[PDB]
Amino acid sequence: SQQVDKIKASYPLFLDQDYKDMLAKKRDGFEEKYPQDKIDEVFQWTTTKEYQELNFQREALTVNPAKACQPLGAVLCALGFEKTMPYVHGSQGCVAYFRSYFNRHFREPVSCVSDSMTEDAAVFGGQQNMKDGLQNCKATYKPDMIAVSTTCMAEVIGDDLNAFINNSKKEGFIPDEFPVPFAHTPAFVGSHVTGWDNMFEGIARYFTLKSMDDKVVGSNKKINIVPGFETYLGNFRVIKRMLSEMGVGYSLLSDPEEVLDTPADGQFRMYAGGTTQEEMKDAPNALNTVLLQPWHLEKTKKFVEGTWKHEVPKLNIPMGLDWTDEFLMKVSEISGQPIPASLTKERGRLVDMMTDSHTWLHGKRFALWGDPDFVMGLVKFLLELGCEPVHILCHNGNKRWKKAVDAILAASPYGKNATVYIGKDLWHLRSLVFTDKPDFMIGNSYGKFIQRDTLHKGKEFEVPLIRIGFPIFDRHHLHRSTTLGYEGAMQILTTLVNSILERLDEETRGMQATDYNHDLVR
Amino acid sequence: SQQVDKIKASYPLFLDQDYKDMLAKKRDGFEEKYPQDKIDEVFQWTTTKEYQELNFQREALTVNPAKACQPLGAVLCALGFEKTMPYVHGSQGCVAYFRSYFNRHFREPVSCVSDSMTEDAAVFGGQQNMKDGLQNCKATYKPDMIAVSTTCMAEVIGDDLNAFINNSKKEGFIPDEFPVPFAHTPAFVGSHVTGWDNMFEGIARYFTLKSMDDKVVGSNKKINIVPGFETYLGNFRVIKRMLSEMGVGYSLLSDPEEVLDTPADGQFRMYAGGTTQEEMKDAPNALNTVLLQPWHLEKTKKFVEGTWKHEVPKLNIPMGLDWTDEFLMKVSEISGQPIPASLTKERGRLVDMMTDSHTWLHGKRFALWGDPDFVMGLVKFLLELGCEPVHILCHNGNKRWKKAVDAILAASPYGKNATVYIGKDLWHLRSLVFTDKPDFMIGNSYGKFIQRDTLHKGKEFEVPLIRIGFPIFDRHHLHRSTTLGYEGAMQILTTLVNSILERLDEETRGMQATDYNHDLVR
Amino acid sequence: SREEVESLIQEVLEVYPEKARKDRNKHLAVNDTQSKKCIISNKKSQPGLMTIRGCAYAGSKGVVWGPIKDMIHISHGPVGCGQYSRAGRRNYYIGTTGVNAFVTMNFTSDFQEKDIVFGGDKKLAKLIDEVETLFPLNKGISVQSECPIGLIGDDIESVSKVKGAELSKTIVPVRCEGFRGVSQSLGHHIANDAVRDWVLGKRDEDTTFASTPYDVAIIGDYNIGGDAWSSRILLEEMGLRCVAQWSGDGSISEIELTPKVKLNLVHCYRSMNYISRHMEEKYGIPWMEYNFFGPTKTIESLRAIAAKFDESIQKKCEEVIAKYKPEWEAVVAKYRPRLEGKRVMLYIGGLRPRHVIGAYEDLGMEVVGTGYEFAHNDDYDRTMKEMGDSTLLYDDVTGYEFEEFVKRIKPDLIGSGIKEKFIFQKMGIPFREMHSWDYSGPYHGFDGFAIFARDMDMTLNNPCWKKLQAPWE
Amino acid sequence: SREEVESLIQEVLEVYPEKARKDRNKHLAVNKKCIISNKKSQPGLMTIRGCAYAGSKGVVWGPIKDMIHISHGPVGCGQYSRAGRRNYYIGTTGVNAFVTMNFTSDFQEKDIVFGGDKKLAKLIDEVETLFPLNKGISVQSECPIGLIGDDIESVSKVKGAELSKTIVPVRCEGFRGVSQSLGHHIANDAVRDWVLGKRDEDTTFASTPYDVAIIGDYNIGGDAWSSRILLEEMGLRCVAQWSGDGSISEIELTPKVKLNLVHCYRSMNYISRHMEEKYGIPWMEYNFFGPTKTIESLRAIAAKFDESIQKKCEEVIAKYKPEWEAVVAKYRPRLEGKRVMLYIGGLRPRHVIGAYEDLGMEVVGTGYEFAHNDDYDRTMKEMGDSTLLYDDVTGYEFEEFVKRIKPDLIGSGIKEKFIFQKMGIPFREMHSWDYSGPYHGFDGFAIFARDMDMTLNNPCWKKLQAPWE
Ligand code: ICS
Ligand code: ICS
Ligand SMILES: [Fe+3]
Ligand SMILES: [Fe+3]
Ligand code: NA
Ligand code: NA
Numbered sequence A, B: 001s002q003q004v005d006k007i008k009a010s011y012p013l014f015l016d017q018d019y020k021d022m023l024a025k026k027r028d029g030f031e032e033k034y035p036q037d038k039i040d041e042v043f044q045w046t047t048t049k050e051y052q053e054l055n056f057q058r059e060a061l062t063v064n065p066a067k068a069c070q071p072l073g074a075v076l077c078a079l080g081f082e083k084t085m086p087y088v089h090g091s092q093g094c095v096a097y098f099r100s101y102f103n104r105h106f107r108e109p110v111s112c113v114s115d116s117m118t119e120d121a122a123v124f125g126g127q128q129n130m131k132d133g134l135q136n137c138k139a140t141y142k143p144d145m146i147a148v149s150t151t152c153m154a155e156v157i158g159d160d161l162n163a164f165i166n167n168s169k170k171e172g173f174i175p176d177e178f179p180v181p182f183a184h185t186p187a188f189v190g191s192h193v194t195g196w197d198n199m200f201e202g203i204a205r206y207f208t209l210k211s212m213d214d215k216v217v218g219s220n221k222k223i224n225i226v227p228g229f230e231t232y233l234g235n236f237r238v239i240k241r242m243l244s245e246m247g248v249g250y251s252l253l254s255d256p257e258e259v260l261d262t263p264a265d266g267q268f269r270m271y272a273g274g275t276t277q278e279e280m281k282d283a284p285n286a287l288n289t290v291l292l293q294p295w296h297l298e299k300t301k302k303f304v305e306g307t308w309k310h311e312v313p314k315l316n317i318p319m320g321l322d323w324t325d326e327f328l329m330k331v332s333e334i335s336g337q338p339i340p341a342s343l344t345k346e347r348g349r350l351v352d353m354m355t356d357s358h359t360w361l362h363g364k365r366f367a368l369w370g371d372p373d374f375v376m377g378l379v380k381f382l383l384e385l386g387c388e389p390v391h392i393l394c395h396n397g398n399k400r401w402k403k404a405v406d407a408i409l410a411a412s413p414y415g416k417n418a419t420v421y422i423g424k425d426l427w428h429l430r431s432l433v434f435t436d437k438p439d440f441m442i443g444n445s446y447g448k449f450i451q452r453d454t455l456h457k458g459k460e461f462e463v464p465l466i467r468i469g470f471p472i473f474d475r476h477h478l479h480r481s482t483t484l485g486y487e488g489a490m491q492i493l494t495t496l497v498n499s500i501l502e503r504l505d506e507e508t509r510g511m512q513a514t515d516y517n518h519d520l521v522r
Numbered sequence C: 001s002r003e004e005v006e007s008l009i010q011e012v013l014e015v016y017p018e019k020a021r022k023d024r025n026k027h028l029a030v031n032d033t034q035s036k037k038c039i040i041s042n043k044k045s046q047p048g049l050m051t052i053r054g055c056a057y058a059g060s061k062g063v064v065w066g067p068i069k070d071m072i073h074i075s076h077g078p079v080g081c082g083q084y085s086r087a088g089r090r091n092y093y094i095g096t097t098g099v100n101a102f103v104t105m106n107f108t109s110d111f112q113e114k115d116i117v118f119g120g121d122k123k124l125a126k127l128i129d130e131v132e133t134l135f136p137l138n139k140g141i142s143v144q145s146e147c148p149i150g151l152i153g154d155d156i157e158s159v160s161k162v163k164g165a166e167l168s169k170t171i172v173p174v175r176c177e178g179f180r181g182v183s184q185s186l187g188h189h190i191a192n193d194a195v196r197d198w199v200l201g202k203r204d205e206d207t208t209f210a211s212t213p214y215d216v217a218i219i220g221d222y223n224i225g226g227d228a229w230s231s232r233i234l235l236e237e238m239g240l241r242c243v244a245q246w247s248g249d250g251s252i253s254e255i256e257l258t259p260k261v262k263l264n265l266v267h268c269y270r271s272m273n274y275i276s277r278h279m280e281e282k283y284g285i286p287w288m289e290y291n292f293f294g295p296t297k298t299i300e301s302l303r304a305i306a307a308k309f310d311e312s313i314q315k316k317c318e319e320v321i322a323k324y325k326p327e328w329e330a331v332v333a334k335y336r337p338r339l340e341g342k343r344v345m346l347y348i349g350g351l352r353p354r355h356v357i358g359a360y361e362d363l364g365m366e367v368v369g370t371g372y373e374f375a376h377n378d379d380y381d382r383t384m385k386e387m388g389d390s391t392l393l394y395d396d397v398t399g400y401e402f403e404e405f406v407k408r409i410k411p412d413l414i415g416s417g418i419k420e421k422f423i424f425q426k427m428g429i430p431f432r433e434m435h436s437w438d439y440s441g442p443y444h445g446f447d448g449f450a451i452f453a454r455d456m457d458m459t460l461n462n463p464c465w466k467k468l469q470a471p472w473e
Numbered sequence D: 001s002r003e004e005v006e007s008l009i010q011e012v013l014e015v016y017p018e019k020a021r022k023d024r025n026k027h028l029a030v031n032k033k034c035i036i037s038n039k040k041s042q043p044g045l046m047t048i049r050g051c052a053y054a055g056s057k058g059v060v061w062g063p064i065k066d067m068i069h070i071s072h073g074p075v076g077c078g079q080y081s082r083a084g085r086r087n088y089y090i091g092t093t094g095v096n097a098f099v100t101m102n103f104t105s106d107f108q109e110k111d112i113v114f115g116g117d118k119k120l121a122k123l124i125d126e127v128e129t130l131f132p133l134n135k136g137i138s139v140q141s142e143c144p145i146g147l148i149g150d151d152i153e154s155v156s157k158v159k160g161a162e163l164s165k166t167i168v169p170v171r172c173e174g175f176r177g178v179s180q181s182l183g184h185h186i187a188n189d190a191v192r193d194w195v196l197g198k199r200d201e202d203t204t205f206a207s208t209p210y211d212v213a214i215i216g217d218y219n220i221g222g223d224a225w226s227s228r229i230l231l232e233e234m235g236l237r238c239v240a241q242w243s244g245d246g247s248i249s250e251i252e253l254t255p256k257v258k259l260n261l262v263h264c265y266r267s268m269n270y271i272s273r274h275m276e277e278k279y280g281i282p283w284m285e286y287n288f289f290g291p292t293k294t295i296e297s298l299r300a301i302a303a304k305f306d307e308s309i310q311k312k313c314e315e316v317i318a319k320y321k322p323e324w325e326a327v328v329a330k331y332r333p334r335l336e337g338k339r340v341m342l343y344i345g346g347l348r349p350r351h352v353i354g355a356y357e358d359l360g361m362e363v364v365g366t367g368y369e370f371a372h373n374d375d376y377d378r379t380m381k382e383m384g385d386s387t388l389l390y391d392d393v394t395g396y397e398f399e400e401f402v403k404r405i406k407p408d409l410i411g412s413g414i415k416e417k418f419i420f421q422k423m424g425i426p427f428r429e430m431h432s433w434d435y436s437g438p439y440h441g442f443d444g445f446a447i448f449a450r451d452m453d454m455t456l457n458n459p460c461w462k463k464l465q466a467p468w469e
Helices: A017-031 A036-046 A049-056 A070-079 A092-106 A119-124 A127-141 A152-157 A161-170 A192-206 A209-214 A233-245 A277-281 A298-306 A320-335 A341-361 A372-385 A399-410 A426-435 A445-457 A485-507 B017-031 B036-045 B049-056 B071-079 B092-106 B119-124 B127-140 B152-157 B161-170 B192-208 B233-245 B277-285 B298-308 B320-335 B341-361 B372-385 B399-410 B426-435 B445-457 B485-507 C003-013 C018-027 C056-065 C080-084 C113-118 C121-134 C147-151 C156-167 C184-200 C227-237 C252-260 C269-283 C295-306 C311-339 C357-361 C377-386 C399-409 C418-427 C445-460 C463-467 D002-013 D018-026 D052-061 D076-080 D109-114 D117-130 D143-148 D152-163 D180-196 D225-233 D248-256 D265-279 D291-303 D307-335 D353-358 D373-382 D395-405 D414-423 D441-456 D459-463
Strands: A084-089 A145-150 A223-226 A250-252 A288-291 A365-369 A388-394 A419-422 A440-443 A465-467 B084-089 B145-150 B223-226 B250-252 B288-291 B365-369 B388-394 B419-422 B440-443 B465-467 C028-030 C072-076 C141-145 C171-174 C215-221 C241-247 C264-266 C287-289 C343-346 C366-372 C392-395 C413-416 C431-433 D028-030 D068-072 D137-141 D167-170 D211-217 D237-243 D260-262 D283-285 D339-342 D362-368 D388-391 D409-412 D427-429
Touching: A017 C227, A017 C241, A017 C252, A036 A049, A036 A426, A036 A445, A049 A426, A049 C121, A070 A084, A070 A092, A070 A145, A070 A192, A070 C080, A084 A092, A084 A127, A092 C056, A092 C080, A092 C418, A119 A127, A119 A152, A127 A145, A127 A161, A127 C018, A127 C399, A145 A152, A145 A161, A145 A192, A152 C147, A192 A298, A223 A233, A223 A298, A223 A320, A233 A250, A233 A341, A233 A485, A288 A298, A288 A320, A320 A341, A320 A372, A320 A485, A341 A372, A341 A485, A341 D414, A341 D441, A341 D459, A365 A372, A365 A426, A372 A388, A372 A399, A372 A485, A372 D459, A388 A399, A388 A426, A399 A419, A419 A426, A426 A445, A440 A445, A440 A485, A445 A465, A465 A485, B017 D225, B017 D237, B017 D248, B036 B445, B049 B426, B049 D117, B071 B084, B071 B092, B071 B145, B071 B192, B084 B092, B084 B127, B092 D052, B092 D076, B092 D414, B119 B127, B119 B152, B127 B145, B127 B161, B127 D018, B145 B152, B145 B161, B145 B192, B152 D143, B192 B277, B192 B298, B223 B233, B223 B298, B223 B320, B233 B250, B233 B341, B233 B485, B250 B277, B277 B298, B288 B298, B288 B320, B320 B341, B320 B372, B320 B485, B341 B372, B341 B485, B341 C418, B341 C445, B341 C463, B365 B372, B365 B426, B372 B388, B372 B399, B372 B485, B372 C463, B388 B399, B388 B426, B399 B419, B419 B426, B426 B440, B426 B445, B440 B445, B440 B485, B445 B465, B465 B485, C003 C018, C003 C028, C003 C392, C003 C399, C018 C028, C056 C072, C056 C080, C056 C141, C056 C171, C056 C184, C056 C269, C072 C121, C121 C141, C121 C156, C141 C156, C156 C171, C171 C184, C184 C252, C184 C269, C215 C227, C215 C252, C215 C269, C227 C241, C227 C295, C227 C311, C227 C445, C241 C252, C252 C269, C264 C269, C269 C287, C269 C377, C295 C311, C295 C357, C295 C445, C311 C445, C343 C399, C357 C366, C357 C445, C366 C377, C366 C399, C377 C392, C392 C399, C399 C418, C413 C418, C413 C445, C418 C431, C431 C445, D002 D018, D002 D028, D002 D395, D018 D028, D052 D068, D052 D076, D052 D137, D052 D167, D052 D180, D052 D237, D052 D265, D068 D117, D117 D137, D117 D152, D137 D152, D152 D167, D167 D180, D180 D248, D180 D265, D211 D225, D211 D265, D225 D237, D225 D291, D225 D307, D225 D441, D237 D248, D248 D265, D260 D265, D265 D283, D265 D373, D291 D307, D291 D353, D291 D441, D307 D441, D339 D395, D353 D362, D353 D441, D362 D373, D362 D395, D373 D388, D388 D395, D395 D414, D409 D414, D409 D441, D414 D427, D427 D441
Parallel strands: A084 A145, A223 A250, A223 A288, A365 A388, A365 A440, A388 A419, A440 A465, B084 B145, B223 B250, B223 B288, B365 B388, B365 B440, B388 B419, B440 B465, C072 C141, C141 C171, C215 C241, C215 C264, C264 C287, C343 C366, C343 C413, C366 C392, C413 C431, D068 D137, D137 D167, D211 D237, D211 D260, D260 D283, D339 D362, D339 D409, D362 D388, D409 D427
Antiparallel strands: C028 C392, D028 D388
């Protein structure tokens, strides 16, 4: 039933007595449910060390992954270029999912197309899809550029992306001068971030490999900045803001912050901002190229060093206090520009915030997951704050990275109870947070089911989630935040300190039970 | 007892059994405590409409005020001037309290002094305190200026500040050229925002009243901005950022954002930044003066109109969409600068955010409190978002203000269930949220004790707090936030939408009970 | 409108190249009885034109099998498909996730290139065993193939027989490779056939279930936001016994019991008419379509369903009608005035483009355009009657097409999916999500109609829509 | 070195005018006939000191949990002191306890003109209808009450008799005294004249030979609950706690006890002296900061009783030994050699010195806001040779002493904290314990050690210097 002055949605409508009894009758009549004492028993078992051993013995089953497939990153890389359309050679279902996955994180239109390969294309490949693809997309959505990646069907049947595109130009479906950079992006290798790297290196070479005789390192007095797979719009904006404040000439290669943030003003803008094809042609004339997320930009690096001849500096992601510092000093050297007063003050304001909040941050234990550059940033800054990163899980991480993180962990007292897991997923993480309970998790929305399971064991066992990362689907507008730079650090610090205080407020709200400690001043 | 590898603080230390039995022994033996069922009975009763009628019949007793004394704002105003020491003529206790109340909100040093009047000054007056206090202040802390207000002691006995200062210059304690603006700031009149107005008019008079002869409205092609009592560093910055984006020459008269945010770099800076004595002396040559918080700047307005001959525009506080638009359009007419594209875009992003979050905000019911301009700005923005400001409380409001708020509410479908209360306190508000339960409160840290009371009645009766205002003592760094302009509106919208989604997550985390509606996507 | 509609259609198609303009023209029509004379459908998508459609894996894993709560469903392939579709569909269920229900989890074989090379069949059998030690209370296993499984010649049907026999478990192979068919639609048929061959027969001999003359099954209600619980409760207040819910909140045992029922209630024709035809041939059980969207359609469907039984169910039907009548009339009285006259364009998948029309009309709105992503001609035959004359019909609408139609027609509200939402919000047009219900609902039944009406009202009349244009212009 | 310290004091006093320079010179020393104390503050110099209202309402009366305390006067005073002091209690705030509420008469000009006494009587009645389970009312006078000639004692008597309720008038006006100090004395006298005697004729309380009252522990952080536990494991019976987590009834039973355990001499020695005069109850000072002082205290307290209590004392000492030695084992290495400059109120600048030394730290400078020369006499014995002593320190002075001495750790108040963090000196709050605590007893020593360590060795301090500076 409903009272029209207070309509109830599914929660709490289905808690009304009549619904609760129906569901009881449904279950007892026809579901053949396992008894509740057997369910509680199996649940208790799934929180135990014995279950964790079996769990970590898995080799063929993956449960709750913390990664996506390569072409999701190829899309986001190409969305970063001016009036370019992401185009994914293969089956159309993948594009429907890429679009959706990004619509719900950014809450924004995300344009991508497919050439709708099907059963028949399996037999003789997708050449005709591509010819008609490019012509149709070009005529209909009017891009200056179309950037091509592949779904797993395309990869497996062995389509030649280079040959099909050329033939589409030879057969006159698209103008020859029309740019169609491309990359192979197979879902069964690496992850969404790899697809970013592969697509980036695709577009760098398209605009550059054949034109190098003309180029002179440093002649354009700018610094190239390659950001990688990046889902926070404040991360593009902080980088641009700090370089401008120091007066460094920079080209940010792959810049989606305009297209993922258009204004609602009566009209739908398919394309906006982005790296010009021209900044790409002239990128080899820069002083150097800085890779903001080196641990998923290996292929790009080999190209900018091999072909552009840049001496790419060994910089970590500029997260937290030390790595931001080192990034600015490296930029200062390359460019000849001093670090200005405004950034020196902002550093000192971050350090001040660290001094004001250290007593609530000290010894707080964290389980955390994500992509490898972002997770090692978090590890580094958490250590700088005096927090203990206990569980560090990177599903798409590798041995070489894990060694770097373990080196970082050993250079600090706060990393000594910490362990790094590569190749493990969120069902492994579930066990770790039951058997070796941290105080919080830091991660993406999928961690809400781990929080829920831990509460089911008890309120004393609950591990509250702090949403940082990708994707974030159950809160609005966090995609606008920042995690890099002194600003990003100020944001992460504020968010952790207040998660801690909010949790403490909740545990001490009980009147005449725990409220002796419900302090007005914390 | 304590285990050295996991030390316990008061929470949860005192929940150990032996402490538990000791507290029960203490109570039963010696407290003569009313029995628990009587305590329950009185608590229940304090939640009822009957209790609420008694509560609103109060007229001598105030319980949990939502306001402070005038001299607290005279201090904050004076802190906004360059190398200025705030100086409170009267008793030292008040200054100890001002300093700690601000220290705890801004987590920064707060410089202010007293002239330590005691019992023997009550009988013969504080003339000697003023003579010694200024000479000691000026020699020890070396301010370029000293700004004098009063403790309620100094007011009651009738000290003449104009006279005592003139004597101090005549008798050579401070130079004659040394600026010593002054203002009476009686604690038993108005509130802390009245002190801000009083002090500000004080300083303006000191630097301009006798010097009008040469002044020409408009000659300096600038707009003066008077901010009023402001405890968000973000609100100074957004105002300056938007006027610089528009290319508008502007003089922010009283600007503390530097003194309240000095870097931690190895040295203490008592003074930093602030409105220059040159700026105040030149202020009459502005085209006009804008008052950001008109409802506590009545006295300033009269002086700027009366002596400066500025035609102060009728603007609301620039909070929310409609009022930020009115502010920028007024600024544009006065200055002749067109509103730039960057700001038109930011507006469009604010509307986008509202359009992406309307489903979750719509009809959500709030209680809120604070200073008059701040509260009507909150009210306005809730109405634009489709929320219902049910209980609006302004302890330091007045009948004229209430009539302006009641008109705003009447102009909107979402004001139909809203009532505005002036001269009521947070013990009154506590009854309103028992008897006419909102979904949330928006206020300062004192509302945390109402949330606590609501939960004791029951988890279905809990009203969760959203901390916006002053003071905020139990979370860190929120003083860095923004609440004016589009930026501020985007911050508030984000906080509100995500506080609604945090609450729904908590209500639906119960495994097999409510987690049918624990959606990954919201 | 009539000649202006057929005009509009020709202006939009002017942009395309020749081959696609001539295909797309056959998938746009203006309404005036047999769709095989008006519009063509269920045909492949024109490459590169930004269709909304998904794949057969979405159709089988995402829509048909994934909701079945006490089975574990393996996404067999690379890590992409299972991730993008984890918990993106709100097929609600009661259960203890990770212990005895598993709908919002993502089980997957995470194919690497080695598995592409040697085959993933030995990986599958190893993963079936790990599933067994770690999730001991699962009641069966489905293996939903992703694009690569077929293309490399694996044989999941043999892994299923052998592992199924070895452990005495149901393991259902489903060959829902994304490249099969043209849309989610084939996913529905592949999945239905998989249920027939591997599940539905499991109790043909068994007769230990006690039947009654009033046993029914709800077929194709995936309980979005509880939509199907809002339907069951009415059916049981009418005297009936819902022995099974396919697949919203459905248990594998409820599916094995459906051949015992006396009548198959089919909400989503498109996705489940296959299995319903089969259950009529083999078991003799009749089926009918129904529509619980809005009180007019809901009332008509109760009365039609009670007419298949005796008086007592017919008596109870009238008692249900009269109980809830004051409730939806209070809903109408409150929201019809705020929504009457407003014009809606719909673009959804296979059923709602026609089935929700009655609930808009009950609030006094007018559906001026609708379209389906992957419907068949029998869906369009049913739609012709629900739509008014000279309304615009569009099949597998492209992104350009939908944007250009909306600019000319200027609906007051658009109802479509996530990929379309932020497009029209930017343009200033109230949008409501008609798949996820915009995280609201249910919309089925009387209790659902109060929520639908409150939802359409809150979005259409929200203050944000008056603010799109800065006062300086 | 003594003379290197004696020239730091002279160099700093060079900035002052002559009147203030000659007065400040007597309030700074390198260690009775050594330093002056408890004098009026020099105008203009930014002292840390509060008023007699803070010392009466904020420290002595406020914690008493079942009474309602009225801030009589304008809104400011009660508002700044709402919940700022962590005097912990067990209770149901708003019905039977009221510590973190702010009751006030909210004086407007009308009351400054016609008086506030009719308003006060109306407020008493309103408090009675809205808070039925209160067990008494206190009225705490802000600066204006005295100065306009109100008569709160008459209102208190008249209304008290009318309603049969304890209503305690307190003239703690902020202009009286020179500091919080006078507020302590005024508050004690108020207790004496209006509460303490309520049960002089009553004889139904069942005594024992082990009864005891804790005097002057305000239960900051729980400090006094972690002291009660030890006293009671020793076999004693703590009949009352003053004023932390205290109830009026516990106050009224204090004259029935065998011994008064004074923690805070400064704030409560007044009442203790009175209970010895009138009721014959001896008193003694004790110190529960750190294990050395807590052991030495337990043993001295136990010695005022029989062999039974003396045994149990040794069972308590031996129970907790493994725990505090573990604390030292873990934290003395991380904190040994570090120097500390302290500035607090009336007691902790000397009482906490034993705890620092147990962790191997050296207190090189200490001082009080409002101590008397009897407090300083006690301090001489606790402080080392040639350390620095400062009374009613000025902001300028405390900043300048810190710059030359360069302590490793400073402990003072909120008004000082952010100043030195900026300078990059580890700072720990030694009034509010920085929201941590308790620090008294053995349980509190574990927290105190954990807290000095986390701050002194925190990674943040290594970062104040930009690598390009
Ligand atoms: S199953 Fe179909 S597209 Fe019939 S695949 Fe699709 S939960 Fe749609 S119009 Mo998402 S044929 Fe259901 C549908 Fe309708 S997933 Fe839901 S909304 S009634
Ligand atoms: S009462 Fe005194 S200033 Fe003895 S007024 Fe002050 S809770 Fe201090 S050094 Mo705040 S004589 Fe207590 C004190 Fe010491 S408030 Fe606390 S910390 S032990
Ligand atoms: Fe958006
Ligand atoms: Fe600070
Ligand atoms: Na796919
Ligand atoms: Na005062």
